[PDB]
Enzyme design. Structure first.
Site, short mmCIF file in Angstrom:
data_model
loop_
_atom_site.label_atom_id
_atom_site.label_comp_id
_atom_site.label_asym_id
_atom_site.label_seq_id
_atom_site.Cartn_x
_atom_site.Cartn_y
_atom_site.Cartn_z
N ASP A 108 -11.09 -2.50 5.57
CA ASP A 108 -9.81 -1.73 5.57
C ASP A 108 -10.34 -0.17 5.75
O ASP A 108 -10.53 0.35 4.63
CB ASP A 108 -8.83 -1.81 4.30
CG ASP A 108 -7.75 -1.31 4.36
OD1 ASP A 108 -7.16 -0.34 5.34
OD2 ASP A 108 -6.94 -1.40 3.48
N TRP A 161 0.45 -8.88 1.14
CA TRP A 161 -0.36 -7.85 0.47
C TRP A 161 0.38 -7.01 -0.35
O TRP A 161 1.53 -7.00 -0.51
CB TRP A 161 -0.61 -6.66 1.78
CG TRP A 161 -1.76 -5.66 1.15
CD1 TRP A 161 -2.97 -5.72 0.71
CD2 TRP A 161 -1.39 -4.32 0.60
NE1 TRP A 161 -3.52 -4.54 0.29
CE2 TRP A 161 -2.26 -3.66 0.17
CE3 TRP A 161 0.13 -3.57 0.57
CZ2 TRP A 161 -2.27 -2.26 -0.52
CZ3 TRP A 161 0.09 -2.32 -0.08
CH2 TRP A 161 -1.27 -1.73 -0.29
#
Length: 324
Positions: A102, A291
Site C-alpha cells: 500500500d 478493509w
C-alpha cells in the site's frame, strides 16, 4: 475461480474486549488464523520501505524522504528498508496468501498526481528548472515528467520483484491499481476516464509482475445510492478489462469498506452492501477484500457495533453471495 471474500480488518485490536471475531468464518469469509492483522491469508503493508517522497509536516511545509522524488532517490536504501519492514511486520517466508503493498504518496504516471500527490510534480519541475534556467515551460515539464516516470517505474518494479523473490508463494499487488477515476466532477459517470484507460493499457510493466489486481471501490455518502453502484461498476469493469488483456489474467480482488469514505462513523446501509457486492460479482470480479481502519476498532462500542453488523448485515450477504 471461486469468488472469495477476505477479512482485512484489524479486529485483533478487539481481542482485549473478548471479541475475537470467530464468526467471520461462519459466513465463508476467509480470515487469518488467530485473527492476526498481517497473517496467513492476507497482509497489507502501509507505505513499506522508504519510497522517495515529500512528506507533509502538517504545518504547510514538507520534509524530503530519500530524495523527495524517485529520480533523486537511493534504491538501495529503499529496498533494504523494504525487506526489513516486511520481516518486522510479518516474518513468514513461506507466506502464501495475498500480499498488498500500500503506497499512495504518488502514482508512476506523472499526470495522475492530484491533490496531496501533486507536490511531487512541482518538485520534479523545480529540479529541472534550476538545472536549465534558459528552458521554456514545455521543455521543463516534458523533461521532468520523463525523469519522474522512469524512476517511479524502476522503484515500483524492483520493489515488487523483491517482494516476490522473498515471499515466492504469495500473490503480490499494489493497493488501488488499476485506477479508473469515475464518478468525479468532470466525469460524473460510471465510465472510467478514457485517458486513464489508455494509460492503464500501457502499464503492463506493473500488472504483468503482480499476481492480483486490487482496485478500491470505497463509496461516499455524497453520491446517490445509484451513483454508488456506478462507482463500483466502472472500477471492477476496468480492472477486469485490464486483467483480460494481460497474458496471465490475474485475479481481481476489490477493496471494500463497511463505512462511507466521507462519513467514516456511518456504516453502509444494507442496500448499499447488497448492491455493491452484487456489482462486483456481476462485473467479473474474483473476490472482495473487506478493509478496515484502526479507527474503526479502537473502542469497545465500535468493536461491538462491528460484530453486530457482521452477524446481522454483512455476514448474511457475504455467505449468500458465495453460497446463494
Amino acid at each position: 475461480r471461486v469468488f472469495n471474500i477476505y477479512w482485512n480488518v484489524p479486529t485483533f485490536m478487539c481481542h482485549q474486549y473478548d471479541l475475537y471475531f470467530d464468526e467471520v468464518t461462519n459466513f465463508n469469509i476467509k480470515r487469518n488464523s488467530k485473527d492476526d492483522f498481517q497473517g496467513d491469508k492476507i497482509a497489507i503493508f502501509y507505505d513499506p520501505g522508504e519510497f522517495p517522497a515529500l512528506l507533509s509536516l502538517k504545518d504547510g511545509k514538507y520534509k524530503k524522504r530519500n530524495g523527495g522524488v524517485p529520480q533523486e532517490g537511493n534504491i538501495t536504501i529503499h529496498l533494504q528498508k523494504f525487506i526489513e519492514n516486511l520481516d518486522k511486520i510479518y516474518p513468514n517466508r513461506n507466506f502464501s496468501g495475498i500480499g498488498v503493498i500500500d503506497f499512495e504518496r504518488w502514482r508512476p504516471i506523472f499526470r495522475q498526481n492530484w491533490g496531496n500527490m501533486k507536490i511531487h510534480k512541482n518538485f520534479s519541475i523545480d529540479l529541472v528548472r534550476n538545472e536549465h534556467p534558459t528552458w521554456n515551460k514545455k521543455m521543463i515539464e516534458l523533461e521532468a515528467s520523463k525523469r519522474f516516470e522512469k524512476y517511479a517505474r524502476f522503484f515500483m518494479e524492483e520493489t515488487l520483484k523483491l517482494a516476490k523473490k522473498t515471499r515466492k508463494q504469495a500473490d503480490w499487488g499494489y493497493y488501488g491499481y488499476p485506477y479508473c477515476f469515475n464518478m468525479s466532477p468532470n466525469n460524473l459517470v460510471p465510465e472510467c476516464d478514457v485517458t486513464a484507460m489508455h494509460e492503464n493499457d500501457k502499464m503492463s510493466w506493473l500488472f504483468n509482475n503482480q499476481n492480483v489486481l486490487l482496485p478500491s471501490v470505497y463509496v461516499r455518502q455524497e453520491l446517490t445510492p445509484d451513483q454508488r453502484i456506478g462507482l463500483v461498476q466502472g472500477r471492477v469493469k476496468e480492472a477486469v478489462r485490464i486483467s483480460n488483456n494481460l497474458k496471465h489474467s490475474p485475479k481481481v480482488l476489490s477493496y471494500w469498506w463497511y463505512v462511507y469514505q466521507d462519513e467514516t462513523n456511518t456504516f453502509l446501509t444494507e442496500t448499499d452492501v447488497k448492491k455493491t457486492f452484487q456489482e462486483i460479482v456481476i462485473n467479473g470480479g474474483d473476490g472482495i477484500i473487506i478493509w478496515g481502519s484502526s479507527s474503526d476498532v479502537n473502542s469497545l462500542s465500535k468493536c461491538k457495533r462491528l460484530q453486530d453488523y457482521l452477524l446481522t448485515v454483512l455476514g448474511p450477504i457475504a455467505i449468500n453471495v458465495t453460497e446463494a
